[PDB]
Design a protein around this ligand. Structure first.
Ligand code: HEM
Ligand code: NA
Length: 250
């Protein structure tokens, strides 16, 4: 909503479609879906609505942005995609990385997140420090997702569910381990685990836990744990919005 998507040529659209297929095979084979989803979200999550700066505009490939502490390990993601990107010179890096995130959700069994091409690659990375801090709580989440990005409380909880795939690594964030028993399967297990309490072998970040105690976030955790279809619907909505921050009249 509020979006006017740009026209791209037929050749551009053809390349999107071909790149989508190549990304499915590559991501599935390399077992890197969680890392690609992180790459897409960290690219998008820097958007500040008040200044219209940052966002999903290809800047995460910049050595300067990769160097941000919140981006530890994403240099691997960028390197992994470079040979594929080279097969699609017509596409912006901006579009390619968001497409990789959409594909990451799909190949792990998640919802089909709508994708619209046309993001332009911007020259300057945003300032460091805009991405969410895992050690903080509900006020912080609203500052970053709501005040900066312009997303809703519903979008915050749904997007937190992205942790249903993947794991933290002690050499990247310092945190360690998967949120779920099935880290390459996209489902509502993140919320199920968040509710059941701490289980050995599984991770919960303070930021994950903050969902449980917030008056608005908690009913959403409950809904998603009870209804995976509702989670998938809200997740697809939220991911689309995230992937489109600052893009197509924002
Ligand atoms: C809600 C606020 C968030 C916080 C505090 C947060 C924090 C973190 C941290 C600390 C890690 C571990 C990085 C590492 O050590 O490898 C991580 C990983 C991850 N994040 Fe988030 N994140 C948030 C939101 C999101 C969103 C919105 C998405 C996408 C929708 C997402 C997707 C992922 C995925 C898939 C991984 C696992 C990556 C892998 O397996 O290598 N996260 N997150
Ligand atoms: Na899972």
């Amino acid at each position: 909503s509020g979006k006017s998507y740009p026209t791209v040529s037929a050749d551009y659209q053809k390349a999107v479609e071909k790149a989508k297929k190549k990304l499915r095979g590559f991501i599935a084979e390399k077992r890197c879906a969680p890392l690609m989803l992180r790459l897409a979200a960290h690219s998008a999550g820097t958007f500040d609505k008040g200044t219209k700066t940052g966002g999903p505009f290809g800047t995460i490939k910049h050595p300067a942005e990769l160097a941000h502490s919140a981006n530890n390990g994403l240099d691997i993601a960028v390197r992994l995609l470079e040979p594929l990107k080279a097969e699609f010179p017509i596409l912006s890096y901006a579009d390619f990385y968001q497409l990789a995130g959409v594909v990451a959700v799909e190949v792990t069994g998640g919802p089909e997140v709508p994708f619209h091409p046309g993001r332009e690659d911007k020259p300057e990375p945003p300032p460091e420090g805009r991405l969410p801090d895992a050690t903080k709580g509900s006020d912080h989440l609203r500052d970053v997702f709501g005040k900066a990005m312009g997303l809703t409380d519903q979008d915050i909880v749904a997007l937190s569910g992205g942790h249903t795939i993947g794991a933290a690594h002690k050499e990247r964030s310092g945190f360690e381990g998967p949120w779920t028993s099935n880290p390459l399967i996209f489902d509502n297990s993140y919320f199920t685990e968040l509710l059941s309490g701490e289980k050995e072998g599984l991770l919960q970040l303070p930021s994950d836990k903050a969902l449980l105690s917030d008056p608005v976030f908690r009913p959403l955790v409950d809904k998603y744990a009870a209804d995976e279809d509702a989670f998938f619907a809200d997740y697809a909505e939220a991911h689309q919005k995230l992937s489109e921050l600052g893009f197509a009249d924002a």
